[model samples]
Target: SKGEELFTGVVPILVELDGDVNGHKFSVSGEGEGDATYGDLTLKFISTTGKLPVPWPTLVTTFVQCFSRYPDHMKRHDFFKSAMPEGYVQERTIFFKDDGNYKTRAEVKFEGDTLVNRIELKGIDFKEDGNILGHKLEYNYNCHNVYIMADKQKNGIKVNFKIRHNIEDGSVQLADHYQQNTPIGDGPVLLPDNHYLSTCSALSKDPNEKRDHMVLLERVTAAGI
Candidate 1:
């Protein structure tokens, strides 16, 4: 599946954190697989190096800061390909053509030299808590992010999701659904596949490409640089 392919890759990336932590660095990598029968996707990572400051701060940066997507390709590849280092925020609304039928609003902000990204999901609550047999009656999320950059080109990007959920009994649950924060240590670097380049080429042809934003915040909070 095209969606599954996005999560599949052994791409090399140089990751750096800015703002709150000052200047944290890493050699992060990306890979993933999908459950086609259920349309479930999982993106995997191996932290390659560097120490993360204790008690990670709420990153004011965003996911899109370290990631850029294509209309033709749904893969989580590409970042610097369309990088605009002018230091400003660009907002865009993306419509998903799938059964869940939702829109992802992205705010890509290049704050100073750091990439501050945010993604908001709308019109789809099936995955939200308390909907049907879901756990919480309602939910909101705040996320942290980083980009795995390739010196030559760009690879993949990732974000850890911290979700806020409402209980049927009038309570709330706060959690790190993706457990995004991890230490980067020396290990096997990401091996490149042609899919990333192809995605970049496809994006290069699109004339409507622009910055966008949506969902989850509360800062003093954070991605790519």
Candidate 2:
């Protein structure tokens, strides 16, 4: 039981974000199960700052499933040290996204307990509407980085992502960095009818826009996605 503190398919995992991208500040909480064939995990971004696009829930489904069977930090270091009698660098590739026209791949490498995932982007076309008036709508980019490490204190996986692109590409001149999902101190998370009233009501409001009846309902369903 000691080693199995956090098991697979862990649900209602409370999530906190330091800096990712909601314009201002926000928090997200979710629950999901590990996939058997195609995915390592599925995370539903249920609730957060209302700044998120209306289609966010439909878009965000899963995360943190890449290193499913990967050993913990302690065990990982030990295994690597013994595996390389002399010196060796190993890499593995996971095909995470594939539609028909384009596909995305993550090439992973390991150094002890630390892991590096590089999302390759060369000929792929990313689509994002520019907020700037009359700006080109094409979302151009290069590669992205995801660094993973095991949290010793919380015994959970910690990761950070950097969306990288060229300055001449578009509105984005520099990489936007954000830390990974860290658990809430007081929560594994409990999914109920209303876990969002305390947080959602405080969202920044505009006088012109009228609030709808199903707004809360929409958010609750999204958070559990």
Candidate 3:
């Protein structure tokens, strides 16, 4: 007997990068595939609207991480309690690192495909640090709130999410806001020819900061693993 088939198909996705980093502005559009098997999601970029840079891959990876993992992560932590007309709410602390040292308290509410996540970082200090680019940074605190909403259209799924961080520093702030609409056809295919639109932005604020980055992407395709 078969175990179960949660979700298995290909989803087309597009990403647009339009933002500035360290006073360097970027406007890139890329095409990618989102492959999903039993709820596992992966993305692969095929082409770009312009020349891809060194940091572009990381940005795309982060995007995929948030889009694919958050729902399941919430479900695993029992963030969805009951399905009512009003909604469901759950709150708990999740450990990030080993030794149970670093953890964040998360308050989440779910209604259908819509979710709101409020996170508070504790037992961890956001200290001034340096990165690979040899830049000094400052951080007073780290906290963020995420809101995600999904709608099923006639031929696709439209999702929009916004994340706001409460931090006073000159570090790279990724994924301040995001919006995407993907179209999935009815079948099991390896690589389907499809295109969609997704846009996101990031920022950093500091007088001495020279490596703040942002972008606006355009059409791309993706499939689920």
Candidate 4:
């Protein structure tokens, strides 16, 4: 599912106060999948060492800093995705999508950089007893984020969340119940095969394809009803 495919990868080796000691600790390791670049000298002339996976931090930094401020408020689901450094917060496994949605960003902060102005991404310590999930019954952190990077930072651009948070409360009675794009008309709109995508929360400057916050049918499993 969209949520699962987002944060399910490269388990953490050691995360501060978030792993091994808390419910967020993932055990997987060694980048399994999610935007990996593989090729046998596809670039010709020169040679490359090790797997060139997409830089998750490049993505974390852009969105975390951009959206963590006022203006947009904490309206994005990738809120926690921006709170930790790439090295510490591992994506060794993805338990999202399907009925196993487990990508909820607890909190976020910037770790001063050991190199120049570059900073590290930090995840919030949810169970630290200082969790931000206080009483916002409307909080649904299961969301996905895509990146958009250009240049080398001198004149570079970054987009945080290509996808926004899609909230849904069983009852359609509340005013915010329409937060999801399910389009509840006469009957159920979202089935096992159908989905939604209505993007309302994202970096407008993103160069990549925008998100559809409305429910959408992403993957299809044939012969299964």
* TM-scores for the candidates: 0.24, 0.30, 0.27, 0.20
Which tens-of-lDDT digit does each residue in 54-129 have in candidate 3? 2332333233322232233233211112221122222223221111211223333222333323333232222223
Q: Write the per-residue lDDT of candidate 4 for residues 71-175, one digit (tens) a residue.
A: 122123222222233211212112211212122221222233210111122323332321112211222322232333322222222232322223233321111
Q: Which candidate comes out best when scored by lDDT?
A: 3
- Model 4 spans > 4 angstroms off: 1-12, 17-133, 137-145, 154-157, 166-225
Better of 1 and 3 by TM-score: 3
Q: What is the C-alpha lDDT profile of model 1 across 1-225, one tens digit per residue? A: 322243233222222222111123323232222222222322322333533221111111222222333323322233322333321222222211111222333443334433333334333322322222233233233333322323322122333333333444765444332212111222222322222211110001113522221122222101121
RMSD list, candidates in order? 18.4, 16.6, 16.0, 20.0
lDDT for predicted candidate 1 compared with the true structure? 0.27
Q: What's the distance in Å from true for residue 201, model 4? A: 17
User: Model 2, stretches more than 4 Å misplaced?
Assistant: 8-12, 16-27, 35-39, 47-49, 53-67, 71-74, 78-161, 165-173, 176-225
Find the 10 residues in a row with the least total lDDT in model 3. 76-85
Which of candidates 3 and 4 reaches a greater TM-score?
3
Off-target runs (Cα >4 Å) in candidate 3 are 1-8, 40-225
